[PDB]
């Protein structure tokens, strides 16, 4: 699925991200835009042999098992394939674990580089949530 901005905003709200660990919904929408371009199927290979998966580009070195990342962990206890569903539940649930790992949304460099410091509330403007 390729989500629309407000479509994703609504789905993330329904799955409990609005103000999760102190991060307003706009942060999550902005992160998804710059990580995956709202694309649930997005994958990107990394220099270390890990891959980023799905709408929030969750990395196989720490968070999910793809059986092709030597030395990696699976801290969300899920196969990375689950993060390539059109339904965002698995990605949201794993993101909640990532953000609670005690470094906030800094885990998403695209968020820190392209969202943090901007008015992220603009990302949910005009959505009827
Ligand atoms: Cl997998
Ligand atoms: Cl969904
Ligand atoms: Cl899940
Ligand atoms: Cl917001
Ligand atoms: Co990445």
Cβ contacts of residue 31 below 8 Å, gap of 6+? 56, 105, 108, 110, 111, 115
Residue 114: domain span: 1-129
Ligand nearest to the CA of 88: 2
Ligand nearest to the CA of 77: 3
Q: How many CB atoms lie within 10 A of CB 37?
A: 11
> Among the options 35, 48, 87, 119, which is catalytic?
35
> Among the options 7, 18, 48, 52, which is catalytic?
52
Q: Which domain CATH number covers 91?
A: 1.10.530.10
| H or E element in which residue 52 lies | strand 51-53
Catalytic annotation present for 35:
yes
Residue 68 CA to ligand 1 centre (angstroms): 8
Q: How far is CA 121 from CA 22, 42, 55, 70, 81, in A?
A: 13, 24, 19, 39, 31
Ligand nearest to the CA of 50: 5
Please state, in angstroms and rounded to a whole number, the distance separating the CA atoms of residues 114 and 60: 22
> Is 66 annotated as belonging to a binding site?
no
Residue 67 CA to ligand 5 centre (angstroms): 18
Determination method here?
A: X-ray
Residue 129 CA to ligand 4 centre (angstroms): 12
Count of helices and strands (H, E) across the chain: 4, 3
Residue 122 CA to ligand 5 centre (angstroms): 23
What's the total number of domains in the chain? 1
| H or E element in which residue 58 lies | strand 58-59
Q: How many CB atoms lie within 10 A of CB 115?
A: 23
Cβ contacts of residue 114 below 8 Å, gap of 6+? 30, 34
């Amino acid at each position: 699925k390729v989500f629309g901005r407000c479509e994703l905003a609504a789905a993330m709200k329904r799955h409990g991200l609005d103000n999760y660990r102190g991060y307003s919904l706009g942060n999550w929408v902005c992160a998804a835009k710059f990580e995956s371009n709202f694309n649930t199927q997005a994958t990107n290979r990394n220099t270390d042999g890990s891959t980023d998966y799905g709408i929030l580009q969750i990395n196989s070195r720490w968070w999910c098992n793809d059986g092709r990342t030597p030395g990696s962990r699976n801290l969300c206890n899920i196969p990375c394939s689950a993060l390539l569903s059109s339904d965002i539940t698995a990605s949201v649930n794993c993101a909640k674990k990532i953000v609670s790992d005690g470094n906030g949304m800094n885990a998403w460099v695209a968020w820190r580089n392209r969202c943090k410091g901007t008015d992220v509330q603009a990302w949910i403007r005009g959505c009827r949530l």
